[PDB]
């Protein structure tokens, strides 16, 4: 397996490893990326965040259950040089994570696409809005099964929404 960086500093660069919706996030980003600060809820591969990277966005933070797989993502961190300021991996699941009552917002931008038939996302969601995890404006990125459960928490707006296949692909903003 392997991951290619399609944007940024690192674009054409391929990356060892065990859509249209994402081009208009990172559109509206262009603007604020270089001081949005993300988290990628579920890493596997890491493409999202390492995307995020390339297009130099203040930080990203991996959250990743699987040690195998949070020690690649490290690997490839350690690969192309990045500062503990600029990418942080923590080994855990972002459900138990998320628990975690902040005192102050962390994210900028939100990369949600756990597996499917487990409400996982919207126990995610739940657990952002709930634990002061959101900085204002804050765009969530959501990749849910294809057809029905997503409802917008009510102090978020449904900016995009597409499904092709069996993949719904959502966009919120956090407006509160």
Request: charged content about 5%.
């Given at each position: 397996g392997e991951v290619r960086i399609?944007?940024?500093?690192?674009?054409?660069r391929k990356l060892p490893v065990l859509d249209r919706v994402k081009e208009t996030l990172f559109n509206w980003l262009m603007?604020?990326?270089?001081?949005s600060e993300c988290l990628d809820?579920?890493?596997?591969?890491g493409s999202l965040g390492f995307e995020a990277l390339s297009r130099q966005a203040k930080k990203v933070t991996f959250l990743e259950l699987d040690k195998t797989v949070a020690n690649q993502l490290k690997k490839n961190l350690q690969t192309l040089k990045c500062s503990s300021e600029q990418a942080e991996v923590i080994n855990q699941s972002s459900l138990d994570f998320l628990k975690q009552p902040q005192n102050q917002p962390h994210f900028d931008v939100v990369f949600l696409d756990p597996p499917f038939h487990f409400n996982l996302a919207e126990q995610a969601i739940s657990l952002l809005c709930e634990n002061n995890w959101l900085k204002p404006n804050a765009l969530i990125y959501v990749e849910t099964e294809k057809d029905k459960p997503l409802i917008t928490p009510e102090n978020w707006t449904l900016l995009k929404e597409k499904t092709t296949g069996i993949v719904s692909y959502r966009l919120y903003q956090n407006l509160e």
């Open positions: 399609i944007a940024g500093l690192w674009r054409g603007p604020y990326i270089h001081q809820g579920f890493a596997g591969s």
